[PDB]
């Protein structure tokens, strides 16, 4: 009532594309507990790396690392299908407990991070400075990442839809599409958002028939 224990900075994990995803937001009063269900990036992925971050920067690499830990034993499935619930829990004493739980396998891995770990009172103030100083640049990075994830979903999805369409797809369209996928896959390898959107444009246009067959 005269004071508050708060989180100076946001706390969370690194997610597909090097993005920091936030669990517990800046200036939250402890004790506190937030959960979020995540999934796997890649097909038949048997583990996930839980990389714990402190900071306000969109790029995981610009934020302060507090440790990382694996949850193994993820039973084979398509990417985006496993349920990994991730829980940040700050008790009344300032200690952070992060758990990942595979909601199919029941398996669990925790890490426990001292109240003292992470950025000192100064670093905190610098981090907020950089957040507002690099807002524009963080935004641009977010849009590239989101665009790369949009690109990759369109690629992964279209390849499946070609496998299940088999002989249904006119060889002609299958030629046009397999060329747009190879180019899309190359562009995804770069940092040019415009060029990824242009290969996504190329795929859309030549995939009208494939799309029909998926129904």
């Amino acid at each position: 009532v005269l004071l508050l224990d708060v989180t100076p900075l946001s706390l969370g994990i690194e997610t597909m594309g090097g993005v920091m995803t936030t669990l517990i937001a800046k200036n939250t009063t402890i004790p506190t507990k937030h959960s979020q269900v995540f999934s796997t990036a890649e097909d038949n992925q048997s583990a996930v790396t839980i990389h714990v971050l402190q900071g306000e920067r969109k790029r995981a690499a610009d934020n302060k690392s507090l440790g990382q830990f694996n949850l193994d034993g993820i039973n084979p499935a398509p990417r985006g299908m496993p349920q990994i619930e991730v829980t940040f829990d700050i008790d009344a004493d300032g200690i952070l407990h992060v758990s990942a739980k595979d909601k199919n396998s029941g398996k669990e891995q925790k890490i426990t991070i001292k109240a003292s770990s992470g950025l000192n009172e100064d670093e905190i103030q610098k981090m907020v400075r950089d957040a507002e100083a690099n807002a524009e640049a963080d935004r641009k990075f977010e849009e590239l990442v989101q665009t790369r994830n949009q690109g990759d979903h369109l690629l992964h999805s279209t390849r499946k839809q070609v496998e299940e369409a088999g002989d249904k797809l006119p060889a002609d369209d299958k030629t046009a599409i397999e060329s747009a996928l190879t180019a899309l896959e190359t562009a995804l390898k770069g940092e040019d958002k415009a060029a990824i959107e242009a290969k996504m444009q190329e795929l859309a246009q030549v995939s009208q028939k494939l799309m029909e067959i998926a129904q």
């Binding site: 597909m16 995803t21 979020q36 995540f38 990036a41 996930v48 985006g80 990994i84």
Partner: peptide, 4 residues
């Protein structure tokens, strides 16, 4: 949201 997906982890690697």
């Amino acid at each position: 949201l997906r982890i690697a």
